[PDB]
Design a protein around this nucleic acid. Sequence first.
RNA 1: UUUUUUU
Length: 508
Amino acid sequence: SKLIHVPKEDNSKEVTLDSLLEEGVLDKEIHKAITRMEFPGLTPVQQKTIKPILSSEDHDVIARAKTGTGKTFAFLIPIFQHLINTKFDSQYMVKAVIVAPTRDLALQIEAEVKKIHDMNYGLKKYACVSLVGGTDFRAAMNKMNKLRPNIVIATPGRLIDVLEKYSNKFFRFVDYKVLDEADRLLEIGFRDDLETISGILNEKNSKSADNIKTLLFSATLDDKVQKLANNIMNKKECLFLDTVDKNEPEAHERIDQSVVISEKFANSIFAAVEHIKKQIKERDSNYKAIIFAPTVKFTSFLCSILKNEFKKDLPILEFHGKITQNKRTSLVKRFKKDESGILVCTDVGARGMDFPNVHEVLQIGVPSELANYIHRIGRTARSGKEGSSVLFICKDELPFVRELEDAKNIVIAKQEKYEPSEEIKSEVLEAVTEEPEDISDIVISLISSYRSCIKEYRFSERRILPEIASTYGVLLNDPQLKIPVSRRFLDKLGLSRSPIGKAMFEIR
RNA sequence: UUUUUUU
Ligand SMILES: Nc1ncnc2c1ncn2[C@@H]1O[C@H](COP(=O)(O)OP(=O)(O)NP(=O)(O)O)[C@@H](O)[C@H]1O
Ligand SMILES: [Mg+2]
């Protein structure tokens, strides 16, 4: 199917809620709901996508727009309009299915739908139910039955579960499917699930196998995504609506980016602690930040350090995939409203999450995929606000920074070195209450994580892996110490006859 | 159990 580009245009006639009302694109009832939110105007991606999504043409839509610029309402608005346009047809049936890569993002999109309901009660007849893992399955189905929603928001795993059992009852009249964070949902480990989802919806559809229109949204998207989505795009033509120049970097230009380079991976912990201390002092504790880490075990370790240093000054919140889902949801709600605090998380929080007035995004080590650099920093400087980001890495991670330049055109102007004083090392280390076995587990999680991105970030294995491993000795304040391990363990890893392996581990 | 993602 042919791709039709509509590139970023410089002198374009401004589209408004009023102009779309006058033109008959938007009904009064949705116009009213969005007007009462009192936004200055529609964001560029909203201006670009609303009419073409609702167009009577037989096309799919791909939309790219920078982090924090209103992609959610860019699809919710025309979805509501479609529901209004077809209000007498299949009114108890799901007409729009929106898929997201994390449960908390699916739940956020649902909350955005509820904000539309709150601004115009006449829209509550277009009901919405979220289908996400870690929630009571029966309770969500009671809700599907009671509310008979026209909009479903879901994560892939739970959506497949529901579809295998109830696709005939609720899903035979779907007209739109939305992949939010589309590039992520078409990576390995989501792509097959999206194909399963798309195949069921298409098979069960009462009109035809190609009825459903597909909408892809992300801040990080190109032509190569259309190829990946080939098996889920039904239509003969695909509009690529772009609000970013072809060569322009995808990172939001308002973010003040920097990188802090240490000699050792572990030193990035000390750099971050000293940075946060300074910010809490200089801002008089008026500090809201997000700090990203590579693994769940390390995230949790970092939280302990930051509670010991900073719990007297600011709340410290722990956010990753092993936090129970009830607590994930309650901490998201709190961090959205709070003026200050530090959210310490994995890439569970890299994409989509909208926490207002975050001042800074910090990163210890590299993200789980190159694109997530852009999404991580995009947690700040949202909806016209300012923001900064700091990447804390060691020397042996520098090829990541070069890869950002070569692959994504991101050049970080502010780069500086860091060397920890002996006093910061003593201060941080003394409060560490973890047993050596716990420290081994933590460092081992980092080894596995870094191993998996050696190729994509162009790391030198013989340097990055011994440096990560040496974190164990640093944290135990004895840099001669290697990680005690068994032969069978080393065999499983693949480093049993390697000098790299001998530099990292002691067969004990 | 290396980030998520039904159970
Ligand atoms: N027209 C508008 N004017 C001002 N703010 C808006 C407008 N539309 C949406 N917002 C707000 O902008 C914030 C971010 O919107 P959101 O839809 O989460 O951005 P996004 O493009 O999806 N970002 P990301 O998922 O990080 O790539 C939310 O708090 C919205 O309430
Ligand atoms: Mg979004």
